[PDB]
Write a protein that binds this DNA or RNA. Sequence first.
RNA 1: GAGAGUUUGAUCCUGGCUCAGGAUGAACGCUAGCGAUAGGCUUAACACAUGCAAGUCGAGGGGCAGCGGCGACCGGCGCACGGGUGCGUAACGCGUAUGCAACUUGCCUUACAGAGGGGGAUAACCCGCGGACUAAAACCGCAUACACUUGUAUUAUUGCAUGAUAUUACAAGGAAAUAUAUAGCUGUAAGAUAGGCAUGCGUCCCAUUAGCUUGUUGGUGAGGUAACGGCUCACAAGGCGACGAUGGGUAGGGGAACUGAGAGGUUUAUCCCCCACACUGGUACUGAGACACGGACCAGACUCCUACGGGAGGCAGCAGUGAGGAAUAUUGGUCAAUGGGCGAGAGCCUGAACCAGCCAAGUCGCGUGAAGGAAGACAGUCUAAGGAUUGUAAACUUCUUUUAUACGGGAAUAGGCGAUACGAGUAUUGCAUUGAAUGUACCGUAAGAAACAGCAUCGGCUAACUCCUGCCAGCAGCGAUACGGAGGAUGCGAGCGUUAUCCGGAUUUAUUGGGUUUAAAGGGUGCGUAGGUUGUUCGGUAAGUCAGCGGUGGAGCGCUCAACGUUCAGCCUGCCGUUGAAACUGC
Lengths: 97, 191, 120, 76
Amino acid sequence: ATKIRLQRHGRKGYAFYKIVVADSRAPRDGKFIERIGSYNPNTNATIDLNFERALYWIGVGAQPTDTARNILSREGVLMMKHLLGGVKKGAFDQAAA
Amino acid sequence: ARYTGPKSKIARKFGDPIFGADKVLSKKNYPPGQHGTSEYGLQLREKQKAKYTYGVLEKQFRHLFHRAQRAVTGELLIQFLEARLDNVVFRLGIAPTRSAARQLVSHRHITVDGSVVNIPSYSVKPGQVIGVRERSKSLEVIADALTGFNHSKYPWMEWDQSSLSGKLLHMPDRTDIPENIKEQLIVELYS
Amino acid sequence: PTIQQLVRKGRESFADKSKSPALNSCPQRRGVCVRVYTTTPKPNSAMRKVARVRLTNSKEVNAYIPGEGHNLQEHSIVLVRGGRVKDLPGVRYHIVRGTLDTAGVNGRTQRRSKYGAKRP
Amino acid sequence: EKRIRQTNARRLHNRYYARTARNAVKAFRALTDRTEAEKKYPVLASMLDRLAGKNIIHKNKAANLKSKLARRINTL
RNA sequence: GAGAGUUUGAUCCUGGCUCAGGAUGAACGCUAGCGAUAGGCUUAACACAUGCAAGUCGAGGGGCAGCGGCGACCGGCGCACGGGUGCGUAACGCGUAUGCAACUUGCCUUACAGAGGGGGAUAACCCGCGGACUAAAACCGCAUACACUUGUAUUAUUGCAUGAUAUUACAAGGAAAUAUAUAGCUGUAAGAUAGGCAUGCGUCCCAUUAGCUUGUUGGUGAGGUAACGGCUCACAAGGCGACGAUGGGUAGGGGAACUGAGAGGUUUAUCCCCCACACUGGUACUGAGACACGGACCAGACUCCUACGGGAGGCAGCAGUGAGGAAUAUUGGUCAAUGGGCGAGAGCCUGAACCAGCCAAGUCGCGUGAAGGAAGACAGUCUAAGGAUUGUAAACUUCUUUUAUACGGGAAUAGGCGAUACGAGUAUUGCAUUGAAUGUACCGUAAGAAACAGCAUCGGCUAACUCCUGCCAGCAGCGAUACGGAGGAUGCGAGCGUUAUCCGGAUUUAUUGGGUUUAAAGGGUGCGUAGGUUGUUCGGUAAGUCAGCGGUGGAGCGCUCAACGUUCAGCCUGCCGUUGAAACUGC
Ligand SMILES: [K+]
Ligand SMILES: [K+]
Ligand SMILES: [K+]
Ligand SMILES: [Mg+2]
Ligand SMILES: [Mg+2]
Ligand SMILES: [Mg+2]
């Protein structure tokens, strides 16, 4: 299936991951459909993320891995519950906390 | 590697007092050897003079040269050579000679911006602080070179004896650096 | 030629031959000393020591023996490298000293690495 | 051994129904009477559709066979 | 964006050759301290033995002989991926750009409908390769679905020819899985993903390779396929070729990488995309998907074992060993991280991957000490003077680094409380192979740490002794300011040289950018086919040409510094689509 995962694109002893959308059958650092961000666990962890594209792929049904799911839980990408029109029409703001 | 050999032989070969003052600069001053020139000879003499006076080997010197070419090329190569941790420490007077400055930097005695840097080739950008280690401010050898001498003849160092630090205002122009090196010869040789 | 002549025919570029064809694009080869003999130079008048060697690449060539004093003999396994001698027609290869059967030159104190002599 | 046994059993199972369906279409292809063709069509179409939804053959193959037989019986 | 030598007694040209430079998954000789980050059978799709590499589900079923969970069997999913190799293949194989109104697509997401009723074997077990009873989310009917398929229509709308999309109908036919709220099951549609087919242009030499083809070219019909089609099967005759058909030889192809101011070129070592393959051929089968990489059957080598009745392996997965060779490493650790497979989850597995070990080892960085100390002893060249030489010897400090000790990070992030009743947002819990590994700190010490090449010209660097053949060389050549040693000198420096391969100077294939009287080079001379070129002028067109619009394909930050990682400004200037212009070429 289509997945959201991290490819190790760095140096020995310095792991830098690229957040991409790719088929499950593709190799880990090989082919991908779209690049949606970056990830660095060495700092105290800087995350770059395309919010619109990540929302689009999680809406069309790309299954994220565990670490990519945590990265999407951060930066508020899993707000599809709030954006599903759950008997409301306004948009809440939880990013400030 | 490092030269770690005889210095008076190089001093008598080049004539100029690159390492400092010595009695052999005035007594028996001639190129060394029991037996003792083309423009190649003079260019090689100039390049080796720069290398010996700044403690740089050939590959590092070539890297410095083409870095200066990428970013007058001979004019800024000299300031690139001057902007070095050992050279800046030596010019601040905290160490007697350039070899002493190199050893002091290589050992855990010199900090840059509060962090100890022990690479004696680290390029020092303008507006940076180079200072003695706070754990090595009370060495017998560390004080006689700075205190007492107090040359302060360079209008690009700020000393601030009350903190034992030092600052580089800006890269000095090619006329204010007291080095007898014709950069045109070196850039012609490497061109 | 005219532009149309070049369009019809074009330009042809030859291939430069290799100066050591018996090595088969290898730095060194291994052989056996088929014969050990002496040759005369083509205004020198010396006695140059050469060996006819059959290399493992199915080829037989002549290899000069540099230095003074060779312990080699017939049917000896030797290492053969490129390099020719100007005043000797024929030979175009050298024998590496200090490798396999060939021994280093005794009593050498200068240019030691070119003749396989250790530090004394 | 398990894979070999499963493949042999499934091959025999598929061969049974595929050969039965092929024989059914072969027998239907020699019919002449319109009423006989009309009363023999639905069971053959049911068998073909069961095969197609049962993955012995393909849905497009069953559709092609059904279309061919219907167009044949539409012209006596 | 450059040159040097070399034909002569001495010139100026022409022309080859040789050096000088840069780069290797290179090898060899001499000599070797450390750290970081790369790379490691280039020779043969060579042989061997051992072990591992693809399993998982007791929330599917019969059993428990084993204390809860599970050996084994039936069943579901996966093993077509990850990984390895470059044999074969001048081909819609690949690159670039499109089309499918001729296509298929498990797992995933969303929407709409449904899960009602039954019956056979059979594995294991039992009893001796045979006999009997067994269960299903295994297997197969029946009921239902007009959201699907098939056939006949009506109303349309609209295309690119064959036509396509929707409605409104009749007819026939086609499913399921339940288990302990969760996990789910079936049909249909849309999306996403992955494949398939067909196209325009580009894609190595040989004419001491000139005709090739007989389902070959087209039409009708039928069959077959996911699908069009000579894909296959039962009239006309064609089609393709000097813009190179056909035949032969050699290559996997691109981005990269290296290298040239540019023109470009070389080569696929690591890395990524596509293709082909799994000892050699043939056939398939199972599957959503197969050249089936740890699946069959048969036919061929070859190799191994039996106990002569019979059976096994393919080492182009990861590691030992042997051989070939100039030459390339451990029968290592862990699933902690990333990625996969299965599972409701916990979790299990993973020679992918993370790591470590070995290897002058490609690149980068550091050390082998820092400041003073007069002209010891021992070497040379001249009985004194000069070179070694501030060099040693002591006397004063420092520890990068080595050693002994301690602290030791980071890579590790993932019960209630709204409530839409489920998502989702918040606490807690263990979790490191690397690993005394970075780093930090403490004693007592310069203590443990420098080679190699060449010094007569080109070129940086000269005395004396040998030899006067032995020798040396890239050239002028010497056989010595050229051979061998001793003293000094000059390069580079944990490296220095030798060999092999590839580029530039080379304009030594010259479109940019060469020539043909005498240096190589005008056909013996004409006529003429294909082809190339086209006086002047008036209008059309828009093929070349030009322009616009779309689609596609240096500055920071972190490594203590640097190599190196990483981000944005910055080219896309190649291809395609769509609008305009008309001076020149073409018509
Ligand atoms: K962190
Ligand atoms: K399947
Ligand atoms: K893992
Ligand atoms: Mg180095
Ligand atoms: Mg002539
Ligand atoms: Mg004539």
